[PDB]
Write a protein that binds this DNA or RNA. Structure first.
Ligand SMILES: [Mg+2]
Lengths: 215, 226
RNA sequence: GGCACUAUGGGCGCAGCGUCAAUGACGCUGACGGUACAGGCCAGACAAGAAACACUUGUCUGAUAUAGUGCC
């Protein structure tokens, strides 16, 4: 069997000065052949811990590794601003090697509700046979955010796609973009296009809607 | 300090095709180390691919590539190789080569990694984007500011570049990560928030540049009113 | 996997016969089979060697073993 490495949490919000503990659990014994890696967006990973608890040379002393059986924990004693990154455990006990899925450490801030915007399809687009409806959720925190499309109150599945920005470097909020893609024929079979946004900063889910053919 | 790894040989390739990546080592003799390949699909995590052992040349492969990929080394060139055969869209990833360290210094951790080379497997042809305004209006207004944008739609391959007002407008811009549609073409949107009081006075033009297809498109985005 | 019991042609017995990276092992059948030993070979785990494997050199275990059965 392949040894599974599964990390926890998959994402973690902290602030500078926080003690952080990331765990990883091998699906079988991997003895002590476990490495931890830090990766920053757009850059290649860097080794932190080898043999599960040895600080890799040149790595700051606030990082440490720890082992009990198949339980592996990377902890950062006091998070510094360069520690926001994705971290990976790896087992090299046996071939084939395995990485865990990775734990993202993001910057904690106060809760911010998305301002929610909707955009009907362009006329230029409708001429082409496609209808794209775009919902923007702007500058919110935290990142968890349910975006739900309704077309004449029918819940939509399988025809929307989302993208999220990285945490903003200055206000460390997020922004998300959901697009409903329809054929032009489908778009003209309905009236009320609605974006329902569900988020921690809102007292109750916010909706933005338009009627196809509104001035 | 002088240890370095340089991947090369990446590119576009059709499904079922083949590609050979290289890994130029420097600062050390490649004969005395284990060399690995590690890949990262866009937006996903690390995935170990293959490795080769010193002195024996023994090779190891991940299940998802067994029987298609071959790692090897040419120690006279100080280079490692990854031959990829009958590639599939799932193989699209940034491919890293990594050095496992010396046992007594860093166990089996990978102590040096190249910066990776990108492999894209797709049936898609080269195709410039269609650009569509995301017109500002009520329904895109929040008090003092209005949101507006451009939908950059149905292009291949990555990347596009999007600027506002020929670069002059930068604050408030979110250009979203592109999403890969089931047609195999990409799509992104770019939006900027502005003072709603300026919608009548300032023009806004998203500039979309797609060098693969050698296309440049400027869309004026105008308010929708009634 | 452990515990108790049973038995043991070197872990490698002879002689043919087949497979394999063949001064090796592996499987067949036949015949034979009182002991002890000793080398040597070999197998298994491991250590170090720029070394997860393989290679080299060394170490430990091969009746404290290994088959069978019963039991947990
Ligand atoms: Mg029985």
């Amino acid at each position: 069997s392949d040894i599974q490495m599964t990390q926890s949490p998959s994402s973690l919000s902290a602030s500078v000065g926080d003690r952080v503990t990331i765990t990883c659990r091998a699906s079988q014994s991997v003895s002590s052949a476990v490495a931890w890696y830090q990766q920053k967006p757009g850059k290649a990973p860097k080794l932190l811990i080898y043999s599960a608890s040895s600080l890799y040379s040149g790595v700051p002393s606030r990082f440490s590794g720890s082992r009990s059986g198949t339980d592996f924990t990377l902890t950062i004693s006091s998070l510094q601003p360069e520690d926001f990154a994705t971290y990976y455990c790896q087992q090299s006990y046996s071939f084939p090697s395995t990485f865990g899925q990775g734990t993202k450490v993001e910057i904690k801030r106060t809760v911010a509700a998305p301002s929610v915007f909707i955009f009907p399809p362009s006329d230029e687009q409708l001429k082409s046979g496609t209808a794209s409806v775009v919902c923007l959720l702007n500058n919110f925190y935290p990142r968890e955010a349910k975006v739900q499309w309704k077309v004449d109150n029918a819940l939509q599945s399988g025809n929307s796609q989302e993208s999220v920005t990285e945490q903003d470097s200055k206000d460390s909020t997020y922004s998300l973009s959901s697009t409903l893609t329809l054929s032009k024929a489908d778009y003209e079979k309905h009236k009320v296009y609605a974006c329902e946004v569900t988020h921690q900063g809102l007292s109750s889910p916010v909706t933005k809607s338009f009627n196809r053919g509104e001035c | 300090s002088e240890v370095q790894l340089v991947e090369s040989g990446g590119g576009l390739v059709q499904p079922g095709g083949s590609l050979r990546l290289s890994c130029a080592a420097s600062g050390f003799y490649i004969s005395y180390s284990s060399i690995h390949w590690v890949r990262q699909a866009p937006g996903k995590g690390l995935e170990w691919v293959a490795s080769i052992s010193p002195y024996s040349g023994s090779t190891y492969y991940a299940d998802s590539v067994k029987g298609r990929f071959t790692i090897s080394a040419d120690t006279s060139k100080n280079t490692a190789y990854l031959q990829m055969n009958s590639l599939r869209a799932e193989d699209t990833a940034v491919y890293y080569c990594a050095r496992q360290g010396y046992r007594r210094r860093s166990g089996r951790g990978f102590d040096y990694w190249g910066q990776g080379t990108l492999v894209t497997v797709s049936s898609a042809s080269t195709k410039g984007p269609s650009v569509f305004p995301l017109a500002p209006s009520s329904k895109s207004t929040s008090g003092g500011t209005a949101a507006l944008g451009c939908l950059v739609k149905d292009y291949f391959p990555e990347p596009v570049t999007v600027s506002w007002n020929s670069g002059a407008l930068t604050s408030g811009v979110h250009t979203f990560p592109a999403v890969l549609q089931s047609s195999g073409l990409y799509s992104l949107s770019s939006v900027v928030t502005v003072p709603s009081s300026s919608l009548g006075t300032q023009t806004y033009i998203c500039n979309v540049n797609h060098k693969p297809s050698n296309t440049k498109v400027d869309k004026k985005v105008e308010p929708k009113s009634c």
